[PDB]
Amino acid sequence: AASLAPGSSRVELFKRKNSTVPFEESNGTIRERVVHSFRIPTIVNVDGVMVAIADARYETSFDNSFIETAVKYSVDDGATWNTQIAIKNSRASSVSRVMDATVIVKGNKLYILVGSFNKTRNSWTQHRDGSDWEPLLVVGEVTKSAANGKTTATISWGKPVSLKPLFPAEFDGILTKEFVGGVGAAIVASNGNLVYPVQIADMGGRVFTKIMYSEDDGNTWKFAEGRSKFGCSEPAVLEWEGKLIINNRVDGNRRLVYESSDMGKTWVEALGTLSHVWTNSPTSNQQDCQSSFVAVTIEGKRVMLFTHPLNLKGRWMRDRLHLWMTDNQRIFDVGQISIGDENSGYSSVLYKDDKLYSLHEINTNDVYSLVFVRLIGELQLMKSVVRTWKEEDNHLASICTPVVPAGCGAAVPTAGLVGFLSHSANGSVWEDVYRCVDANVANAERVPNGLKFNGVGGGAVWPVARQGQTRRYQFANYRFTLVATVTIDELPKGTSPLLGAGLEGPGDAKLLGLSYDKNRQWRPLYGAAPASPTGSWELHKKYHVVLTMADRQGSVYVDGQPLAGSGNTVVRGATLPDISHFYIGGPRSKGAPTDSRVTVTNVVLYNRRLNSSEIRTLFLSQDMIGTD
Numbered sequence: 001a002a003s004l005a006p007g008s009s010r011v012e013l014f015k016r017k018n019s020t021v022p023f024e025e026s027n028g029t030i031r032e033r034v035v036h037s038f039r040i041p042t043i044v045n046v047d048g049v050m051v052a053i054a055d056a057r058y059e060t061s062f063d064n065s066f067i068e069t070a071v072k073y074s075v076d077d078g079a080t081w082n083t084q085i086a087i088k089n090s091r092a093s094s095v096s097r098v099m100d101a102t103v104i105v106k107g108n109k110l111y112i113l114v115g116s117f118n119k120t121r122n123s124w125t126q127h128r129d130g131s132d133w134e135p136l137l138v139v140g141e142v143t144k145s146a147a148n149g150k151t152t153a154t155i156s157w158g159k160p161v162s163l164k165p166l167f168p169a170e171f172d173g174i175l176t177k178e179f180v181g182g183v184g185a186a187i188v189a190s191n192g193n194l195v196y197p198v199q200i201a202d203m204g205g206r207v208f209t210k211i212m213y214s215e216d217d218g219n220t221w222k223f224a225e226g227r228s229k230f231g232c233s234e235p236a237v238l239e240w241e242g243k244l245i246i247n248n249r250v251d252g253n254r255r256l257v258y259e260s261s262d263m264g265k266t267w268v269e270a271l272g273t274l275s276h277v278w279t280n281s282p283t284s285n286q287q288d289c290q291s292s293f294v295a296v297t298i299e300g301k302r303v304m305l306f307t308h309p310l311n312l313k314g315r316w317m318r319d320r321l322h323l324w325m326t327d328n329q330r331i332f333d334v335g336q337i338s339i340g341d342e343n344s345g346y347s348s349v350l351y352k353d354d355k356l357y358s359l360h361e362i363n364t365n366d367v368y369s370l371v372f373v374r375l376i377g378e379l380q381l382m383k384s385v386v387r388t389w390k391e392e393d394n395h396l397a398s399i400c401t402p403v404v405p406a407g408c409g410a411a412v413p414t415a416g417l418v419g420f421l422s423h424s425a426n427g428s429v430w431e432d433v434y435r436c437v438d439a440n441v442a443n444a445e446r447v448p449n450g451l452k453f454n455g456v457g458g459g460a461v462w463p464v465a466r467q468g469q470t471r472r473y474q475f476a477n478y479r480f481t482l483v484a485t486v487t488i489d490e491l492p493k494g495t496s497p498l499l500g501a502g503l504e505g506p507g508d509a510k511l512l513g514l515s516y517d518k519n520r521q522w523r524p525l526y527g528a529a530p531a532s533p534t535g536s537w538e539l540h541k542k543y544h545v546v547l548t549m550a551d552r553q554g555s556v557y558v559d560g561q562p563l564a565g566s567g568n569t570v571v572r573g574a575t576l577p578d579i580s581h582f583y584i585g586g587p588r589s590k591g592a593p594t595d596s597r598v599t600v601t602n603v604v605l606y607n608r609r610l611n612s613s614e615i616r617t618l619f620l621s622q623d624m625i626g627t628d
């Protein structure tokens with residue numbers, strides 16, 4: 001869906017220059033005051049109560065203006081709401097502000113962390129020092145009760161506490177200036193820790209992120225030792241399989257994602273999963289945007305939800321907010337949750353009592369509202385995809401493979417299984433059994449579990465960099481295993497392509513691949529080295545092919561055994577390769593008029609290098625995995 005889905009709907013919950021908030025004058029007096037713009041949305045669930053948190057930018061939408069933290073809460077899933085000012089600014093000047101809320105929910109408590117400023121008119125990373133700033137922590141307590149039938153709630157907000165005295169003056173050399181939460185919903189780890197991802201500006205104005213956590217419900221806080229590269233900001237964190245996953249805003253480049261198994265002490269870039277998948281615009285050289293990043297359980301499966309604008313317009317327009325869902329292997333684009341080509345921006349997502357919602361910005365002429373969205377259609381699609389994933393994984397995991405010489409052998413490998421091209425194919429499309437990334441086809445005829453190629457450019461292109469803006473197979477530049485069953489149907493004139501990974505760039509370069517020749521020999525291709533012939537094959541005979549790439553090394557297996565040359569380095573230097581696509585057969589839209597006469601079935605893709613036992617299992621069970 002290229003627009004908020006059929007069945008879904010929204011209301012303008014925080015309405016620009018319309019909705020009022022109970023502004024408290026210096027004398028305790030209270031007056032309902034109109035607010036120019038509502039920005040920086042977060043929506044969470046506290047003990048069955050929806051709490052929507054936001055910047056109330058009273059006079060203008062500008063960052064350096066008079067702002068307070070507004071809250072709207074509901075006990076009836078959005079039928080009705082009450083409004084509060086949860087956090088007052090210092091009132092030091094006409095630009096005093098409390099802003100950019102980051103929120104953790106634990107039990108009936110809300111922990112809110114905001115940046116507080118008194119009088120500066122320029123941007124926080126460019127301040128001369130931290131004198132105008134304070135990081136404020138505020139705790140809110142939700143209390144329920146019920147009239148005759150009807151439930152009601154109140155939220156009591158405490159006095160802000162400055163965490164500035166807890167901020168180190170330096171980090172491993174780095175002289176600190178200010179810090180603020182990463183924006184949005186953060187978490188309680190499974191060990192009960194309060195975990196805030198934060199963004200830190202150093203004196204020279206560099207930005208980087210770290211984890212600030214509490215083991216005692218907010219009494220004390222610690223800054224973990226690890227950090228992101230410089231240039232990361234507005235970090236969002238979630239917990240996945242015993243690790244923190246930190247998803248960073250990165251202005252002017254692709255988004256960096258890190259993992260930490262030790263509560264932030266050590267960070268490692270998520271090169272084999274999520275790092276660099278998402279970005280700020282088609283060309284990636286634009287201002288980035290905040291993203292929500294939340295772990296949920298759908299149809300019994302744990303998954304991650306990620307939101308971000310395509311920003312086809314560029315700069316801060318932030319049009320076309322999308323929602324993605326991933327289980328750390330497959331990444332599914334649920335679609336566009338904003339409407340048409342409206343400008344959106346910062347966002348929040350929440351799964352509560354089996355219903356999906358979003359609170360996000362809409363922007364016309366830099367006057368901003370927050371819409372509260374019921375993601376009905378989206379959730380239906382999501383549930384269907386999750387069921388597809390569980391069902392195929394369980395099916396493959398349940399196959400009885402041959403016992404090997406030492407009831408069944410080891411399971412058909414499913415951990416790290418990203419995509420699968422098998423039986424379903426139609427027109428110019430070879431369908432991903434996992435419903436995320438299809439392959440594009442030309443000059444093919446359907447056969448059981450795959451395709452037979454015949455004609456110029458006969459073959460399939462499984463896009464990698466060619467996915468474009470969002471690169472869901474970006475992991476392959478770091479490591480992959482590509483598997484397939486093949487037959488060579490006709491002898492080639494000289495050398496013809498069968499399977500591999502192509503590289504972006506001039507020429508027709510390959511990272512790793514396999515070709516075959518007129519002498520009936522294999523020609524494995526290892527990076528840029530001369531592809532010399534080895535071995536022997538026979539026309540028509542089915543062969544199992546596996547390509548593995550990890551640690552910048554490449555191996556090619558036929559029938560479970562490595563071909564000569566395997567284990568060689570395929571890429572040099574430290575710059576990640578830039579794979580354009582995986583080719584199957586001899587696809588082309590130009591260049592040599594390649595016509596590889598081969599039939600390929602059951603092409604499997606993993607985001608790791610499979611071990612030798614796993615490879616043999618696949619070789620032994622190849623007539624068992626097809627979708628039929």
Ligand SMILES: CC(=O)N[C@H]1[C@H]([C@H](O)[C@H](O)CO)OC(C(=O)O)=C[C@@H]1O
Pocket residue numbers: 040063099100115123124125233288289
């Ligand atoms: C404290 C502050 O300025 N926060 C603002 C943030 C920041 O300025 C930028 O990340 C440069 O560091 O930008 C944006 C934004 O719509 O992109 C909204 C935040 O309110």
